Write a protein that binds this ligand. Structure first.
Ligand code: NI
Length: 341
């Protein structure tokens, strides 16, 4: 059964609620982004209206074979009417096609659902600036002060500089980047651009990337692995065994692997600066864990909420334990008392 925090009161609407069968009284199903925990249950046999971004709708059609007649893509930053209710989709600064949804209820209540997001000060000048929000359904993934990480820009600088140094020292080194879902494409695209290579990958991943409206993409990616010195592989294969095996497959073109695993947070964030990050090495294979996050840090989250000043917060992440729930409620109260709303 669908949990309360996926239901929008006063509407016939649910958000990211595809794994519960037919939800009683739901006339339109919203999908914030194409990540498996959120789309779980969608397929070609789904026959209710799905509302989402253009990019999410490309993935629905091509990857999950959802029929076109049930996909309703909406433009961003545009007031739209759905089953008699005004809605707006906003960029969520998560993975490609990820949105936040503003709902303007018939009784005058305004609700913001963040989906998954990385809060940014740029959001303070979207259509959010123009009215009050009563209820906030918040991505609380990293809602504790131990969760610090660098900007995305500093992380990409580290990766570009690392890869360029390595391959300039040894022109026979291969760079490998791990992936298991959409998001974080900047990691591998930035490295390929500094090395003047295309990124090589499986046909299934190439298909996924061709759905994302990334400009000049035919220029940056390929399925011809032999022509590329940046290869993408499944995240599970980013280990010394899986990388030794891959190196064998390249037929003596290469004699070294430098590999990147973009994680969210790891506890080496509490001690080490990005400048100071070092790899795990075995023989001619080095593996770097880099803290590239597409969720809010604690401080980014706090600033957004203290700016927005909602009357009520509903967490959508870490809601399964009493200890988590109590911790989050304590922070929301601190934030409110410090800011004075
Ligand atoms: Ni996500």
């Amino acid at each position: 059964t669908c949990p309360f925090y996926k239901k929008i009161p006063g509407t016939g609407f649910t958000v990211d609620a595809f794994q519960y069968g037919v939800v009683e009284g739901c006339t339109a199903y919203f999908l914030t982004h194409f990540h498996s925990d959120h789309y779980a249950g969608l397929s070609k046999h789904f026959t209710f209206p799905v509302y989402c971004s253009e990019i999410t709708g490309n993935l629905l059609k091509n990857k999950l074979h959802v029929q076109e007649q049930y996909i309703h893509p909406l433009p961003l930053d545009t007031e739209c009417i759905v089953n008699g209710v005004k809605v707006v989709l906003l960029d969520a600064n998560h993975c490609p096609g990820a949105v936040m949804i503003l709902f303007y209820l018939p009784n005058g209540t305004v609700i913001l659902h963040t989906g998954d997001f990385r809060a940014d000060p740029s959001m303070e000048r979207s259509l959010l600036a123009d009215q009050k929000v009563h209820m906030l359904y918040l991505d609380t993934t990293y809602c504790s002060p131990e969760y610090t990480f660098p900007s995305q820009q500093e992380v990409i600088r580290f990766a570009i500089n690392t890869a360029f140094e390595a391959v300039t020292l040894n022109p026979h080194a291969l760079v490998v980047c791990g992936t298991y879902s959409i998001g974080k494409e900047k990691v591998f695209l930035a490295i390929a651009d500094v090395l003047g290579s295309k990124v090589g990958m499986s046909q299934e991943k190439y298909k996924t990337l061709q759905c994302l409206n990334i400009p000049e993409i035919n220029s940056l990616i390929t399925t011809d692995m032999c022509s590329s010195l940046v290869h993408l592989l499944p995240m599970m294969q980013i280990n010394f065994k899986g990388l030794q095996s891959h190196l064998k497959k390249c037929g003596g073109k290469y004699n070294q692997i430098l590999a990147f695993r973009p994680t969210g947070w790891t506890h080496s964030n509490k001690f080490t600066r990005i400048a100071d990050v070092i790899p795990q090495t075995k023989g001619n294979i080095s593996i770097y864990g880099i803290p590239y996050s597409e969720h809010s840090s604690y401080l980014e989250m706090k600033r957004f909420v203290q700016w927005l000043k909602p009357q009520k917060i509903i967490p959508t992440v870490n809601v399964g334990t009493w200890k988590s729930r109590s911790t989050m409620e304590k922070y929301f109260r601190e934030w409110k008392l410090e800011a004075g709303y």
